[PDB]
UniProtKB/Swiss-Prot annotation:
It comes from Homo sapiens (Human). Changing residue 78 to R: In DDISBA; affects function in neuronal axonal growth; forms cytosolic aggregates; disturbs cytoskeleton organization and dynamics. Isoform 2 is present in brain, lung and kidney (at protein level). It is linked to Developmental delay, impaired speech, and behavioral abnormalities: An autosomal dominant disorder characterized by developmental delay with speech impairment, mild to severe intellectual disability, and behavioral abnormalities including autistic features. Additional variable manifestations may include dysmorphic facial features, seizures, hypotonia, motor abnormalities, and hearing loss. Changing residue 33 to D: In DDISBA; affects function in neuronal axonal growth; forms cytosolic aggregates; decreased interaction with SPTAN1; disturbs cytoskeleton organization and dynamics. Changing residue 96 to S: In DDISBA; affects function in neuronal axonal growth; no effect on F-actin binding; disturbs cytoskeleton organization and dynamics. This is Spectrin beta chain, non-erythrocytic 1. The chain holds residues 173 to 280 of 2364 of the full protein. Changing residue 75 to H: In DDISBA; affects function in neuronal axonal growth; forms cytosolic aggregates; disturbs cytoskeleton organization and dynamics.
Length: 108
C-alpha cells in the first residue's frame, strides 16, 4: 500500500496543472490516455503537443503514448489500447506499466 500510494502521488505531482488529467486511481483515471501522455510530456515535451489531445479519443491517446514511449524511450508496450479503453480496466496491468515510466523518468 505505501508503494502504491507513493506511485499514485508521484503521478499526481508530475501531472499537476495539466488540463483534463485527473488521477485518483490506477484504473478509470487512465482509460482515456490523457494521463499517460501528460507523464511523457512533463519529461519530454518535444514528443507531444498536449494541447491537441481530447479525452474523448481514448484509442488515439493511448496508442500515441504507448508508441512514443516504445519508439523514443525504449519502454515496451505492455498494454493494448483496446484493453485499457474499457470502462473498468485492470489495475495491476496499469500499475506494472506506470512503474516502468516511474523508473525511467526517475533514473537518468
Amino acid at each position: 500500500k505505501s508503494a502504491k500510494d507513493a506511485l499514485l502521488l508521484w503521478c499526481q505531482m508530475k501531472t499537476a496543472g495539466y488540463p483534463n488529467v485527473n488521477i485518483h486511481n490506477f484504473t478509470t483515471s487512465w482509460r482515456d490516455g490523457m494521463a499517460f501522455n501528460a507523464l511523457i510530456h512533463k519529461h519530454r515535451p518535444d514528443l507531444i503537443d498536449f494541447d491537441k489531445l481530447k479525452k474523448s479519443n481514448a484509442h488515439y491517446n493511448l496508442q500515441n503514448a504507448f508508441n512514443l514511449a516504445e519508439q523514443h524511450l525504449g519502454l515496451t508496450k505492455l498494454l493494448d489500447p483496446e484493453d485499457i479503453s474499457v470502462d473498468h480496466p485492470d489495475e495491476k496491468s496499469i500499475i506494472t506499466y506506470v512503474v516502468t515510466y516511474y523508473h525511467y523518468f526517475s533514473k537518468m
